[PDB]
Amino acid sequence: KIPGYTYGETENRAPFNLEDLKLLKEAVMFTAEDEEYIQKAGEVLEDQVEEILDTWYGFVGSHPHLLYYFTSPDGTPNEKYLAAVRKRFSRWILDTSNRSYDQAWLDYQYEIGLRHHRTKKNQTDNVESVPNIGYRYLVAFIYPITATMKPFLARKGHTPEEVEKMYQAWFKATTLQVALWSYPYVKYGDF
Amino acid sequence: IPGYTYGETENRAPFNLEDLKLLKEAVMFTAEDEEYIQKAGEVLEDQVEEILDTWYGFVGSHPHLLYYFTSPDGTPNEKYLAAVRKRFSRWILDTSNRSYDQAWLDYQYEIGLRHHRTKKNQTDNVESVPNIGYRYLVAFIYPITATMKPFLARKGHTPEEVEKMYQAWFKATTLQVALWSYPYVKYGDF
Ligand code: HEM
Ligand code: HEM
Ligand SMILES: NC(=O)c1cccnc1
Ligand SMILES: NC(=O)c1cccnc1
């Protein structure tokens, strides 16, 4: 059992529903074709997760203002916090590819948003860290999380055309999710 | 261009150049991207109309998106659509041609304000829906980025050149939408 991973058993119902999701999927051009290709992406990425995680953790670790969000008050990285989050982050890669984007998925999207936001940050792992991750950086991270995925999608010998379809599905899915995570950040009624 | 007030905004941006430096690092934007975004402008300048038609065609095909240009009776305000189109067209050029400096940041705050209820519908003096839900600005990062790709390949540049121009475009779009969250975000959570 992954500590803190509460998919399917969240405290709250999401403030967005399956009709909201339908319309947001339309805004990111996500269709049944992307459902298929995100699943195929999962098959390609599954045994590569550790190397993907090292790439993403390496990026954050190389910028003091980014590693900042995992630090103790003394400004040093909380290693227990980093490790605990890494397990759930790893599972998120699989979820994106393997879960149906249903109400349970949406409820967990709200949860992940709440956990980056001051509402729930630091509570899952019971750590003393910085209180909030500025929303500017969640949007910003759409780029690195999307673009640095591409070389991994090509590592199993798939053609550039099939890599392109898996990559676009990943881009769309990343964008869709960060959009949802904006909810706890955005003034009530403005989301 | 009616309503276009770049360099002449009545507010200073709440984010400064040090904020921009750090956000550029977050989207992996470097001097290389500075070069390639400028090169993208050279490629895209005389393609703006076809680019606009694609983006407008996407919005027009979805009632929940075209919604944001509608009059209270639910019918599209074509004057609103046309006036915005001119400033949207200029935005494409600005992204490629402006230094990302204080003037640029000031106008980034302005564009955010104009999507938000703070200033939406004031620039063109129209009556339309009061706010554009922030969910859709983030969402639009995908279509605004992805649909640009074919246009960057249309002037005979090499695949490596096209890819670099496209990555620069992706970074810049992401960067800008991040900034535009400011008026939407609960005070102190940005
Ligand atoms: C595309 C953007 C992002 C993605 C896909 C992402 C992914 C994730 C995931 C899957 C989790 C675990 C959720 C769970 O508890 O099950 C998480 C938590 C976390 N992430 Fe992110 N994240 C993003 C943006 C950011 C940014 C910009 C930072 C700043 C360094 C960051 C730092 C953190 C921290 C500190 C936690 C732990 C939060 C807590 O205390 O519960 N994330 N992220
Ligand atoms: C990547 C995301 C987006 C980009 C790059 C973008 C770009 C722009 C630009 C450049 C302008 C003109 C700014 C100026 O006044 O100089 C504008 C205004 C406008 N956009 Fe967007 N936009 C985005 C998201 C959206 C979305 C999701 C909608 C919903 C349909 C939308 C609808 C509008 C409307 C209605 C205006 C006029 C606002 C006003 O009354 O001032 N935009 N946009
Ligand atoms: N490195 C990252 O992008 C990251 C790691 C853990 C949680 N959220 C984001
Ligand atoms: N079509 C679009 O994405 C669009 C058009 C005008 C303003 N903002 C966004």
TrEMBL record, chain A:
Keywords associated with the record: Heme, Iron, Metal-binding
Residues that span the membrane, as ranges: none
Binding site residues for heme b: Y81, R88, F89, Y108, R115, H116, N122
InterPro entries xrefs: Globin-like_sf, Globin-sensor_dom, Globin/Proto, Protoglobin
Superkingdom classification of source: Archaea
Stored SUPFAM superfamilies: Globin-like (SSF46458)
UniProt GO MF annotations: heme binding; metal ion binding; oxygen binding
Signal peptide: none
Chain ranges of the Globin-sensor domain: 19-188
Keyword Heme on entry: yes
Designated name of the protein: Globin-sensor domain-containing protein
Organism listed in the record: Methanosarcina acetivorans (strain ATCC 35395 / DSM 2834 / JCM 12185 / C2A)
